[PDB]
Amino acid sequence: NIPFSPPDITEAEITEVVDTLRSGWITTGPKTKELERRLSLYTQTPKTVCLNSATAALELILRVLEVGPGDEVIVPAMTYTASCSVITHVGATPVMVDIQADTFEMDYDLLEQAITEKTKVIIPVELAGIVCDYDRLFQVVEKKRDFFTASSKWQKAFNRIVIVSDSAHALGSTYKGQPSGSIADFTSFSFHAVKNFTTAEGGSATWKANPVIDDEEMYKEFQILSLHGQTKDALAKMQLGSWEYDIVTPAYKCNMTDIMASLGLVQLDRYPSLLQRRKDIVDRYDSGFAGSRIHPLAHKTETVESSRHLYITRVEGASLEERNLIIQELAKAGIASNVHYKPLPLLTAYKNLGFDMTNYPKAYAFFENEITLPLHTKLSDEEVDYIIETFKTVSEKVL
Amino acid sequence: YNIPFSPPDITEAEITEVVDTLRSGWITTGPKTKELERRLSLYTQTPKTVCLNSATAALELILRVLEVGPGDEVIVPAMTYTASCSVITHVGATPVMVDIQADTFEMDYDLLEQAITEKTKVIIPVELAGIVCDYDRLFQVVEKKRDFFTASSKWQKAFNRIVIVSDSAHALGSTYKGQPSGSIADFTSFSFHAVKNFTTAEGGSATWKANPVIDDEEMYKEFQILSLHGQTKSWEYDIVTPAYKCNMTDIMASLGLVQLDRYPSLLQRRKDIVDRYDSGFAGSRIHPLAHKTETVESSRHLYITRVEGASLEERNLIIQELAKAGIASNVHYKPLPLLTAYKNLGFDMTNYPKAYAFFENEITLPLHTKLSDEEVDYIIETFKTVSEKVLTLSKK
Ligand SMILES: Cc1ncc(COP(=O)(O)O)c(CN)c1O
Numbered sequence A: 001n002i003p004f005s006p007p008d009i010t011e012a013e014i015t016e017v018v019d020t021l022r023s024g025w026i027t028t029g030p031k032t033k034e035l036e037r038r039l040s041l042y043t044q045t046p047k048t049v050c051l052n053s054a055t056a057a058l059e060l061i062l063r064v065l066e067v068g069p070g071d072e073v074i075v076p077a078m079t080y081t082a083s084c085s086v087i088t089h090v091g092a093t094p095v096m097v098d099i100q101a102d103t104f105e106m107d108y109d110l111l112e113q114a115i116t117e118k119t120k121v122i123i124p125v126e127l128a129g130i131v132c133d134y135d136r137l138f139q140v141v142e143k144k145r146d147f148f149t150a151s152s153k154w155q156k157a158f159n160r161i162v163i164v165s166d167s168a169h170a171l172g173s174t175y176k177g178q179p180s181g182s183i184a185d186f187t188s189f190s191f192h193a194v195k196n197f198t199t200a201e202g203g204s205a206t207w208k209a210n211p212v213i214d215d216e217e218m219y220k221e222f223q224i225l226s227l228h229g230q231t232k233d234a235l236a237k238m239q240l241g242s243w244e245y246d247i248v249t250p251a252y253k254c255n256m257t258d259i260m261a262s263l264g265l266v267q268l269d270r271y272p273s274l275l276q277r278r279k280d281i282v283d284r285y286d287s288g289f290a291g292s293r294i295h296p297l298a299h300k301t302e303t304v305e306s307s308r309h310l311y312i313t314r315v316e317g318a319s320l321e322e323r324n325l326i327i328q329e330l331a332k333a334g335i336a337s338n339v340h341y342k343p344l345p346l347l348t349a350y351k352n353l354g355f356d357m358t359n360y361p362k363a364y365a366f367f368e369n370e371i372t373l374p375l376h377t378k379l380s381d382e383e384v385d386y387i388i389e390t391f392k393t394v395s396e397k398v399l
Numbered sequence B: 001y002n003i004p005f006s007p008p009d010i011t012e013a014e015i016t017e018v019v020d021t022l023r024s025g026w027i028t029t030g031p032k033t034k035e036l037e038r039r040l041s042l043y044t045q046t047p048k049t050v051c052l053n054s055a056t057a058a059l060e061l062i063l064r065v066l067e068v069g070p071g072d073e074v075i076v077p078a079m080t081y082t083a084s085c086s087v088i089t090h091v092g093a094t095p096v097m098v099d100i101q102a103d104t105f106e107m108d109y110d111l112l113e114q115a116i117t118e119k120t121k122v123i124i125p126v127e128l129a130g131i132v133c134d135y136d137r138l139f140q141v142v143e144k145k146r147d148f149f150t151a152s153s154k155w156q157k158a159f160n161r162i163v164i165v166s167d168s169a170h171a172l173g174s175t176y177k178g179q180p181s182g183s184i185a186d187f188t189s190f191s192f193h194a195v196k197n198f199t200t201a202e203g204g205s206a207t208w209k210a211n212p213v214i215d216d217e218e219m220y221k222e223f224q225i226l227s228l229h230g231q232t233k234s235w236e237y238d239i240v241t242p243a244y245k246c247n248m249t250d251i252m253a254s255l256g257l258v259q260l261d262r263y264p265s266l267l268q269r270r271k272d273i274v275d276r277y278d279s280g281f282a283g284s285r286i287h288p289l290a291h292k293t294e295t296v297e298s299s300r301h302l303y304i305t306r307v308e309g310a311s312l313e314e315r316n317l318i319i320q321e322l323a324k325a326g327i328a329s330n331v332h333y334k335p336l337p338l339l340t341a342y343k344n345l346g347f348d349m350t351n352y353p354k355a356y357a358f359f360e361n362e363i364t365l366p367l368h369t370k371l372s373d374e375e376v377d378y379i380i381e382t383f384k385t386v387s388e389k390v391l392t393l394s395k396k
């Protein structure tokens, strides 16, 4: 009975959390700070802001950029709701763009056509750990510069559409040897229970090195937005009784605890071997399914080395009904599986805001025959062999 | 002596419970959060409880469940923490601040009446330091102004009046006329932040008192949906609304389950500390807010005191002198209109002079369950001497 995504937690993680629980710092403290430092080294970015979710990280990026009512934010039609929800939270207008025929990525021609005078941010999603075609994306925003008009402080520092990576799945992924985090202008990460790297709940915001961003000043802004808008002046912090503070904006509550950071520090030590195990599982699946009607998204390309978060596959010539039936047959054989994703316009939330599935047929076609197999580091080679064999047999029989 | 203001009280039992969660398959929201909700509902005498990642999340989702938004008004005291008021601006509603009484943190209820309009949807009283507000008076007020109210949402229709939502961040275990906090106001939000009496390092809850016109399961489902991206549901699920991410992990719940077992003895210790302070300061110019009244038995979260005849400058000086003697202290609170955030939205400190007068001479002493009776004795004695000296230097 093979589960889809159980957590891989050892005694080292437990010992580190216990150490936090014997200290005076059980919420944001020295270990969150240390995790930020070490994650910045790993993602090859100057500073990292650890928070309580990727959804928090993604939303604060937008709030730092002061994206708001009147502004537009392009998102793929094929993604998880959290990529798009944050756009509605800040009051901006989501603009969905349909995807390509071979891949989850946005059709970049349609992306170009979708850009307007109101466009402030593109949010590509590094689905399953596979990083998007960023050469193409930066080409597009440069080309469409002068549609852009800066209506905020940080928008002025860039003078173009800002690319913000939804890297929820992509910690440790690379694009042309560069780590995710260091490619897009801003990037958000998830450390949710079911991700490769986890703090049960948690996430981060980072940004690549850019001459027009003071990194300390940018970090201070995230911190302020994450901890109720609280600031202290230099006088108040020097004083022995440092009680006095101001609230500059009526902000949010999404800081990371040293409980979560503890988990993070140990996960990050163990992460390169967890990636290797994930690599070995994917390669064994790839052999197994070669020459079959089961077509996996490629986690190793000319440009990309994926984190290998999700084993997304599509079954050739399978209808919606036939897909649903395969998944149930997989479960009767004790193999959990999933679907990434219903395109956003199938969801009641986005229907209700006027998004219609017929404008994004490639997204629907991706969804129709998609099946995600288990990919985690508690799977054995025998379980992988069984999933391969069963999935091939169950698909044959249904067809 | 170097006495900290609010260190966390964490034992091996809490660590063993978290470790147990870390060996299970459920490291985020799982069976222990569910169990914590159940047990908290029994403790607060409410039917259902929603455990979340902060009181700020709990308070904000209450507002979003009630569909409080642009055009609506929410009354809050001028004397409170920013989190009481921030959530009002987050949903797009308009905050209405009301000044407080001369003797106490509570809103002046005459001014509260006058502040109510056709737009008013919610009053958020704050149970400051664990002291629960005058709810007989508050329900009298909303009932009196009942014709001003019109329900412009589903859950507003269940009440047909202004909804009272308790900011009980400090008040888990407090009671008003024998009733537990949680069971008095229409909705109540709790904080389990590191510095609170009951803690999960970060965490909180929303609950609501028993009301015939609220299906409790249906209300709970709505909170869950808003807390976990709008998801409802065997792969298939729908997202009904583009919602939020504020669920509680079984890591935090673990801490909660053990804290709740230990909580009645932590309250008793806090009771003993407060009583020793009360003796110490009797007949002095140090005037504590009362944690035991005719109506209230406080959780005893904060030992709020005001020093009679101390100016702003003299107060700031006392706090630093307290620190030179190794006694940490704090101020609850700057009135909201002193804060840059609320200044910028047009709130002006001169409309709330009682709130300012409360702030001016307020000093909060340490009240936590790592304090010894010797440390309490030293704080009593020092605070009396440091106040005497600061006033003598000023007269000179
Ligand atoms: C593609 C994508 N984007 C964003 C998120 C947000 O993750 P989190 O729960 O950490 O906010 C997730 C997972 N929830 C995801 O799968």
Ligand SMILES: Cc1ncc(COP(=O)(O)O)c(CN)c1O
Pocket: A253, B053, B054, B055, B056, B057, B080, B081, B083, B084, B126, B167, B169, B170, B190, B191, B192, B193, B203, B204
């Ligand atoms: C009076 C009051 N209200 C609300 C909050 C918000 O609590 P939390 O940090 O758990 O969101 C706080 C801070 N614990 C507070 O002191």
